[PDB]
Enzyme design. Structure first.
Site, PDB file in Angstrom:
ATOM      1  N   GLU A  57       0.725  -1.004   0.000  1.00  0.00           N
ATOM      2  CA  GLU A  57       0.020  -0.079  -0.048  1.00  0.00           C
ATOM      3  C   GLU A  57       0.899   1.220  -0.063  1.00  0.00           C
ATOM      4  O   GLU A  57       0.485   2.372  -0.477  1.00  0.00           O
ATOM      5  CB  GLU A  57      -0.989   0.107   1.236  1.00  0.00           C
ATOM      6  CG  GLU A  57      -2.015  -1.044   1.271  1.00  0.00           C
ATOM      7  CD  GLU A  57      -3.176  -1.070   0.243  1.00  0.00           C
ATOM      8  OE1 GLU A  57      -2.937  -0.312  -0.529  1.00  0.00           O
ATOM      9  OE2 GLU A  57      -3.955  -2.376   0.186  1.00  0.00           O
ATOM     10  N   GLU A 108      -2.026   9.347   0.149  1.00  0.00           N
ATOM     11  CA  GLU A 108      -2.338   9.099  -1.243  1.00  0.00           C
ATOM     12  C   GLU A 108      -1.814   9.955  -2.165  1.00  0.00           C
ATOM     13  O   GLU A 108      -2.181  11.088  -1.746  1.00  0.00           O
ATOM     14  CB  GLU A 108      -3.791   8.807  -1.411  1.00  0.00           C
ATOM     15  CG  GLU A 108      -4.508   8.369  -2.700  1.00  0.00           C
ATOM     16  CD  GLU A 108      -5.780   7.944  -2.690  1.00  0.00           C
ATOM     17  OE1 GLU A 108      -6.364   7.733  -1.668  1.00  0.00           O
ATOM     18  OE2 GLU A 108      -6.514   7.842  -3.725  1.00  0.00           O
TER      19      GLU A 108
END
Length: 219
Positions: free
Chosen positions: A56, A65
């Site tokens: 991730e 992100e």
């Protein structure tokens, strides 16, 4: 538990934000993590958690992100979106959406619904958000912890759907709608590649049922 030096072997490139001490403190908050089962099972669990984390965040290099154009707000009375805030991915498992920041914060005793940026600002909290997801059953899914430590009893429906205990079911829990079944197997294979590498480093087998192309997503 892995030593300080082993954490550096597994995450050689990580951001300095993600300290070993912060990880250890977060884990003390979830005392069954890495302490359930025989010592091989404990290492498999740790390796599996770290494999998903590595996937991730590219080896704990990233905190947030990259694309922050989308607020990840699904309007809710139960977990209302805070004006001006965004629920894009943060932390080791990239906690996303108001309806996950809400319950995660409640479990951790933090107002993450109104201060979601905190997950990318406090490393103990960052690791706790990932352990929250890993350790917490969320019906109809078991916890990844129970799957890896021999404590999950698959239902008859689970068995028929190919959801058998092993690493693959953890990928299914995390993102099976896109990564398992008939999905493109690339991302799931990346997770397995990290897992196999980490198991080799820790001296244990990855165990069985690693892939998830032969299982349906949970309901």
């Amino acid at each position: 538990m892995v030593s300080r030096s082993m954490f550096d072997q597994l995450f050689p490139n990580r951001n300095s934000f993600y300290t070993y001490d912060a990880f250890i403190a977060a884990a003390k908050s979830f005392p069954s993590f890495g302490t359930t089962g025989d010592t091989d099972v404990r290492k498999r669990e740790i390796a599996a958690f770290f494999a998903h984390v590595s996937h991730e965040t590219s080896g704990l290099v990233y905190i947030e992100e990259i694309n922050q154009s989308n607020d990840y707000c699904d309007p809710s009375t139960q977990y209302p979106c805070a004006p001006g805030k965004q629920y894009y991915g943060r932390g080791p498992l990239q906690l996303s959406w108001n309806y996950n920041y809400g319950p995660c914060g409640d479990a951790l005793g933090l107002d993450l619904l109104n201060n979601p940026d905190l997950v990318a600002q406090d490393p103990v909290i960052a690791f706790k958000t990932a352990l929250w997801f890993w350790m917490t059953p969320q019906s109809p899914k078991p916890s990844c912890h129970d799957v890896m430590t021999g404590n999950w009893t698959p239902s008859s429906a689970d068995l028929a759907a190919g959801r058998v205990p092993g690493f693959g079911v953890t990928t299914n829990i995390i993102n099976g709608g896109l990564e398992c079944g008939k999905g493109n197997p690339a991302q799931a294979e990346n997770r397995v590649n990290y897992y196999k590498d980490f198991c080799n480093q820790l001296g244990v087998s990855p165990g069985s049922n690693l892939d998830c192309a032969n299982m349906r997503p949970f309901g």
